Write a protein that binds this ligand. Structure first.
Ligand code: A1D6J
Length: 108
């Protein structure tokens, strides 16, 4: 659980504390945001709270399964949203930090 512990205690913590993480802290609320196509276009949604619960509940078999979920979260944001949107600028800044935290992760 070495790399899964670093994903929880360093990567997830430092993304959560970033000022732009708030849109990713819960699943997209399609009702309150009136985005009725979101869950049709995004078949495999993901968000930081789902990742937080999976790490707390030891749902992941391996670190790479948790990395796939962060990557899906970012990919979904770029797929659904438009290049000039606030949320895309926010995702890009959070993903840059993500890639730095992975570069500093110790080996298993
Ligand atoms: C991953 C993701 C997340 C959000 C999303 N969560 C929000 C939660 N709350 C508010 C607001 C609701 C009203 O109170 C203020 C926050 C806005 C929210 N958005 C959008 C509309 C948004 C974010 C940042 C900037 C601008 C728009 N929207 N899509 C399309 C995504 O792909």
């Amino acid at each position: 659980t070495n790399q899964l512990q670093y994903l929880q205690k360093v990567v997830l913590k430092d993304l959560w504390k970033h000022s732009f993480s708030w849109p990713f802290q819960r699943p997209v609320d399609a009702v309150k945001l009136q985005l009725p196509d979101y869950y049709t276009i995004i078949k495999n949604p993901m968000d930081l709270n789902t990742i937080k619960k999976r790490l707390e509940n030891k749902y992941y078999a391996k670190a790479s399964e948790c990395i796939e979920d962060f990557n899906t979260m970012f990919s979904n944001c770029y797929l659904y949203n438009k290049p000039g949107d606030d949320i895309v600028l926010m995702a890009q800044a959070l993903e840059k930090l993500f890639m730095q935290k992975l570069s500093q992760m110790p080996q298993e």
